[PDB]
């Protein structure tokens, strides 16, 4: 897939992603906070279409992600991220996608997610997160 | 003066400031690096005019500030920053302004300056720096 | 169980833990690096016995943990950490314990594990990790 790296910011305001309940996660885009102002990150799109979009608007700065979880598995011979769930101090968003395969979860006790990087081909191949105090 | 706070970024690419050899530092503006791309910070201007501008273009990312020094003193009854000097791993820029008053200097052994905040009225009243690894 | 919190240090030199191939992880103790010198952390012991010990000596500072993985599951009605695996830039230590239940894994792209906290009763109830640059 095509690798992307948004880098690190001051916080997260909104997440826009798409999924297909039969395959995996597709598009991924984040609106970050940059020192008090919104900063629209680049839209990282799948090479294909047919995904269902969803918008996750956080009540920044009072609301923030405390845990990210999901599943990774094989789709058409490729290991990809099949589902994602975002748990904040207020609500739980998701799961989005297919909850099948190998689970993973990153609970944060102290700190914040301030950026994302990864790769998307037909689906989200992999992703990593920037953490800061 | 009017307080300003640019916040924190990924690095520094260019600094644009103005000074008057009879008084102190006036305008202050920084072009930061934001995850590999230039980010033009807001221009923080003096309430008055008559300053001499100067542009400090750094060879980012190979060149970075290793020490900031200057002088603070009274001008028309106000304590302000009268001069600034920026020393990088390649050159020394300045001193700009009047080298009279009380000196100060911040040498950095490990880390980087990634942001500025302060206040400007007729002159630069005070300033602080964001540091990060 | 009895909660423990070693806090944060400069790095990790050695890990001493015990496990039972029929149940879960028991004792946990770490020898940290504290500014160039070894610092022996407190031994956090299970309320019971019958565990098999193992010593993981790292070639500090050239060798460091890049990924921690394991399994959590029910044992006698309690959710505990049943197995742990430590992957460094040189070898893979483990898995130690029972590889049954729900998997989890924390790969580190940039940064270091510099401390542990958690709780141990009959078995390791849960644990968290301190991360730093």
């Amino acid at each position: 897939g095509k690798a992307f790296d948004d880098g690190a910011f001051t916080g997260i305001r909104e997440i826009n992603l798409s999924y297909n309940k039969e395959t995996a996660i597709g598009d991924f885009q984040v609106v970050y906070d940059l020192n008090g102002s919104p900063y629209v990150g680049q839209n990282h799109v799948s090479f294909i279409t047919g995904f269902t979009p969803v918008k996750i608007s956080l009540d920044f700065p009072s609301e923030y992600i405390m845990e990210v979880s999901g599943y990774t598995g094989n789709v058409s011979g490729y290991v990809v991220v099949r589902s994602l769930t975002f748990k904040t101090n207020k609500k739980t968003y998701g799961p989005y996608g297919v909850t099948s395969g190998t689970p993973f979860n990153l609970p944060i006790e102290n700190g914040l997610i301030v950026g994302f990087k990864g790769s998307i081909g037909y689906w989200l191949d992999y992703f990593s997160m920037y953490l800061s105090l | 003066g009017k307080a300003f706070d640019d916040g924190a970024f990924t690095g520094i690419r260019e600094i644009n400031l103005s000074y008057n050899k009879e008084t102190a530092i006036g305008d202050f503006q920084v072009v930061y690096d934001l995850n590999g791309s230039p980010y033009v910070g807001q221009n923080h201007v003096s309430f008055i005019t008559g300053f001499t501008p100067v542009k400090i273009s750094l060879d980012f990312p190979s060149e970075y500030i290793m020490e900031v020094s200057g002088y603070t003193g009274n001008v028309s009854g106000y304590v302000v920053v009268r001069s600034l000097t920026f020393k990088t791993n390649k050159k020394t820029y300045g001193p700009y302004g009047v080298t009279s008053g009380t000196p100060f200097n911040l040498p950095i052994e490990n880390g980087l300056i990634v942001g500025f905040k302060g206040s400007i009225g007729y002159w630069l009243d005070y300033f602080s720096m964001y540091l990060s690894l | 169980g009895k909660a423990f919190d070693d806090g944060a240090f400069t790095g990790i030199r050695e890990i001493n833990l015990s496990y039972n191939k029929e149940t879960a992880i028991g004792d946990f103790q770490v020898v940290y690096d504290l500014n160039g010198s070894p610092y022996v952390g407190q031994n956090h012991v299970s309320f019971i016995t019958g565990f098999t010990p193992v010593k993981i000596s790292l070639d500090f500072p050239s060798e460091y943990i890049m990924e921690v993985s394991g399994y959590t599951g029910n044992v006698s009605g309690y959710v505990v950490v049943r197995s742990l695996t430590f992957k460094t830039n040189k070898k893979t230590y483990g898995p130690y314990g029972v590889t049954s239940g729900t998997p989890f894994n924390l790969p580190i792209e940039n940064g270091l594990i510099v401390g542990f906290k958690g709780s141990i009763g009959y078995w390791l109830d849960y644990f968290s990790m301190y991360l730093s640059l």
């Binding site: 990774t72 191949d125 800061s132 | 990312p61 990060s132 | 940039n110």
Partner: peptide, 15 residues
């Protein structure tokens, strides 16, 4: 270098 660093955890998914 003159570029700020941050802790990064991952990746999860394909290796």
């Amino acid at each position: 270098s003159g570029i700020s660093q941050t802790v990064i955890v991952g990746p999860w998914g394909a290796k």
